[PDB]
Amino acid sequence: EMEKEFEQIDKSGSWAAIYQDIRHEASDFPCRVAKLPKNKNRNRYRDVSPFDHSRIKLHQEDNDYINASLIKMEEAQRSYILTQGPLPNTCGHFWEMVWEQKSRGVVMLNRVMEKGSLKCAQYWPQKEEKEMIFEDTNLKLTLISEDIKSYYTVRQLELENLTTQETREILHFHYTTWPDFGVPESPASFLNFLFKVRESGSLSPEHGPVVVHCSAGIGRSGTFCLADTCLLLMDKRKDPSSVDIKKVLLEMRKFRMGLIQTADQLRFSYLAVIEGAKFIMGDSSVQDQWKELSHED
Numbered sequence: 001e002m003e004k005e006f007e008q009i010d011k012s013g014s015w016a017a018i019y020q021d022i023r024h025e026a027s028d029f030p031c032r033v034a035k036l037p038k039n040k041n042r043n044r045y046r047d048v049s050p051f052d053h054s055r056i057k058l059h060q061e062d063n064d065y066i067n068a069s070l071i072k073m074e075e076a077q078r079s080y081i082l083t084q085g086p087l088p089n090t091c092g093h094f095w096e097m098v099w100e101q102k103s104r105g106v107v108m109l110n111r112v113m114e115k116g117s118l119k120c121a122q123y124w125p126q127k128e129e130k131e132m133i134f135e136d137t138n139l140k141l142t143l144i145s146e147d148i149k150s151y152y153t154v155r156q157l158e159l160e161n162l163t164t165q166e167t168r169e170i171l172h173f174h175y176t177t178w179p180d181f182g183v184p185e186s187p188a189s190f191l192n193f194l195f196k197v198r199e200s201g202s203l204s205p206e207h208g209p210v211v212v213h214c215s216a217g218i219g220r221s222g223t224f225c226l227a228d229t230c231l232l233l234m235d236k237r238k239d240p241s242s243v244d245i246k247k248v249l250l251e252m253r254k255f256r257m258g259l260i261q262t263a264d265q266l267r268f269s270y271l272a273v274i275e276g277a278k279f280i281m282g283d284s285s286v287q288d289q290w291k292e293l294s295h296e297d
């Protein structure tokens with residue numbers, strides 16, 4: 001049971017050991033496509049690649065490669081696409097993927113500039129009157145509105161397939177204060193944001209998988225998805241005791257390498273799930289408490 005385990009790991013100070021054991025046990029699958037010479041400029045990091053078996057294939061139209069993985073959680077009945085922060089030359093590919101996969105939401109957990117370096121391209125428009133056209137993939141993207149909170153921003157975007165003139169509303173959930181290789185400020189701040197994404201309907205099984213990214217699409221992205229999937233599993237069962245967080249993380253790691261990048265991010269995942277369980281099991285009031293503690297205004 002997660003809370004008993006948490007306390008025992010905390011008491012023995014064994015988070016590093018528990019985390020390294022996950023790393024040891026994690027799946028290793030080929031990434032042959034990611035490593036083709038022609039794809040070198042489509043990868044942000046030499047050593048972070050999608051497995052072949054679970055990579056997202058683009059539908060256009062000469063090179064189908066994007067550094068993105070489908071995390072398909074069978075038991076939970078939820079899927080996510082985890083991807084790197086797009087590069088200056090892959091922003092068209094990124095939106096092509098959103099279109100083809102029928103995603104309704106994009107969750108961004110990094111900033112464009114972190115520690116002095118560009119860790120993600122400016123892939124969405126910052127001003128209504130300055131829309132973006134991706135000529136390579138024939139898409140247009142327009143900022144419709146934004147709601148700026150203290151540590152996150154929600155944006156409404158309109159994505160248009162210029163080939164057909166069909167338009168779709170995409171919601172962008174941008175967590176601006178989650179440091180790289182770090183953790184959210186509190187369980188409250190994290191859960192307030194996760195529940196904002198949930199409330200939007202973006203995770204509905206009626207849509208394609210939500211797109212989640214950070215810079216590599218593994219550390220912060222893995223933490224977010226682990227917490228969400230664990231909460232969903234216990235919600236379906238109404239049984240917190242049934243969820244084995246480490247088992248869930250190892251399952252997710254069948255689909256993309258490196259998910260959760262530090263022992264403290266693993267620790268934080270437990271805190272987030274234990275706290276979120278209060279809401280799942282019927283303490284409605286905790287949601288307002290998180291909103292207050294997150295100081296979002």
Ligand SMILES: CNC(=O)[C@@H]1Cc2ccc(NS(=O)(=O)O)cc2CN1C(=O)OC(C)(C)C
Nearest residue numbers: 045047048181214215216217218219220258
């Ligand atoms: C310390 N790790 C790194 O600097 C790079 C790139 C990177 C950036 C930023 C990262 N954080 S995040 O944006 O939250 O994924 C993770 C990584 C991963 N990485 C690796 O070499 O990863 C493995 C899985 C070990 C191959």
Ligand SMILES: [Cl-]
Nearest residue numbers: 110111112113
């Ligand atoms: Cl940013």
Ligand SMILES: [Cl-]
Nearest residue numbers: 113114115116
């Ligand atoms: Cl900086």
Ligand SMILES: [Cl-]
Nearest residue numbers: 087118120121
């Ligand atoms: Cl970039």
Ligand SMILES: [Cl-]
Nearest residue numbers: 114115179180
């Ligand atoms: Cl950072």
Ligand SMILES: [Cl-]
Nearest residue numbers: 023258259261
């Ligand atoms: Cl790892």
Ligand SMILES: [Mg+2]
Nearest residue numbers: 126127128129
């Ligand atoms: Mg303006």
